[PDB]
Amino acid sequence: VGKHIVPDKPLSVNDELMADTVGKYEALAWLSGGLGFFVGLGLLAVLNDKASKVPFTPRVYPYDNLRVELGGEP
């Protein structure tokens, strides 16, 4: 807006293309820890084996579990 800066020094090669307090690999490590939280929660859910404590038997539909209505051989 105000006054675009007109260069007075030689431009670098990568000037067409040119997050402040944390480092690069440190940020990668923090984010990896954050995702390892999700991994640990998934492993905990595996260890929980909630599927083995379901409090009802599986549903059973009539007419041979709706075989014909689901596209089976009539």
Ligand X SMILES: CCCCCCCCCCCCCCCCCC(=O)OC[C@H](COP(=O)(O)O)OC(=O)CCCCCCCCCCCCCCCCC
In the complex, the residues that contact another protein under the rule CB under 8 A are 1, 4, 6-11, 13, 15-16, 54-59, 61-63, 66, 68-71, 74
| Distance in Å, CB of 49 to another protein, minimum | 14
Partner that binds at residue 29, options another protein, ligand X, none, CB closer than 5 to 8 Å by kind:
ligand X
Partner that binds at residue 68, options another protein, ligand X, none, CB closer than 5 to 8 Å by kind:
another protein
Spatial contact of 30 and 22, defined as CB atoms under 8 Å apart: yes
Q: With respect to ligand X, which residue has the nearer C-beta, 32 or 48?
A: 32
With vertex at residue 65, the alpha carbon angle to CA 64 and CA 66, rounded to the nearest 5 degrees, is: 90
Spatial contact of 68 and 74, defined as CB atoms under 8 Å apart: yes
| Distance in Å, CB of 18 to ligand X, minimum | 22
d(CA 28, CA 33): 9
d(CA 3, CA 49): 65
